[PDB]
């Protein structure tokens, strides 16, 4: 429904792509539409679990061809479930997949959590009486593998013609070796800034009278 000028036979888009045209035989304002394109995605549990495979198409609905259309694209080989559970493998738009009910691949909207209506009044207060000492684990990475690559040996493996052609091209191997060396030094600087905090070396006495704390 665009409107050219009577000489204008075609046009570009904002992104300099030929979007709309006018036919050379007939006075009519057409448009060029890109075809159906998308990404092929595979929904599966582990090979150490099963072999049932669900297929996800990206951003487009089930055109080529269980037909379960979401906002992220076509989705066949799954099972739509009204019972909304916790997300297991993310897909998009708050809709995830899992391996449930004997059992197969299901598809459902991500349940955002156990719904609770915590009580309230003008004067009702909740006071703890008993307690629990839970110990929770955090995992934090610290360093990375120090790695150097002799880039002259990498590019030119035991040559001399290649060595001369590399020496034509400046000090790029020098630059990459210096950058990797600085990386490797700052790795050990990370390790010392994490652990080397107390210059002393303390250790426990053999009498472990700790009030019953194993």
């Amino acid at each position: 429904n665009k409107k050219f000028l009577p000489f204008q036979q075609f046009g570009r888009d904002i992104a300099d792509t030929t979007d709309a045209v006018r036919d050379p035989q007939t006075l009519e304002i057409l448009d060029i539409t890109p075809c159906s394109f998308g990404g092929v995605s595979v929904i599966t549990p582990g090979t150490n679990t099963s072999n049932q495979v669900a297929v996800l198409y990206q951003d487009v609905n089930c055109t080529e061809v269980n037909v379960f259309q979401t906002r992220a694209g076509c989705l066949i080989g799954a099972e739509h479930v009204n019972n909304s559970y916790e997300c297991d493998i993310p897909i998009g738009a708050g809709i995830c997949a899992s391996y449930q009910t004997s059992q197969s691949i299901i598809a459902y909207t991500m349940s955002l959590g156990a719904e609770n209506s915590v009580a309230y009044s003008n004067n009702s207060i909740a006071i703890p009486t008993n307690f629990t000492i839970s110990v929770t684990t955090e995992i934090l990475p610290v360093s990375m593998t120090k790695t150097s690559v002799d880039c002259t040996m990498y590019i030119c493996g035991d040559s001399t013609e290649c060595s001369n052609l590399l020496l034509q091209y400046g000090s790029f191997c020098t630059q990459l070796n210096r950058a990797l060396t600085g990386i490797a030094v700052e790795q050990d600087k990370n390790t010392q800034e994490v652990f080397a905090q107390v210059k002393q070396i303390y250790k426990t006495p053999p009498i472990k009278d700790f009030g019953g704390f194993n």
């Binding site: 004067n123 009702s124 207060i125 006071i127 703890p128 008993n130 110990v135 955090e138 995992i139 934090l140």
Partner: peptide
């Protein structure tokens, strides 16, 4: 210790048992 890592073991306090009380 951990290879290229560290593991914290947080001794945490959690209150468990409550009861509806009326306050002022």
């Amino acid at each position: 210790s951990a290879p290229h890592g560290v593991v914290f073991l947080h001794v945490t306090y959690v209150p468990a048992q409550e009861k509806n009380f009326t306050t002022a």
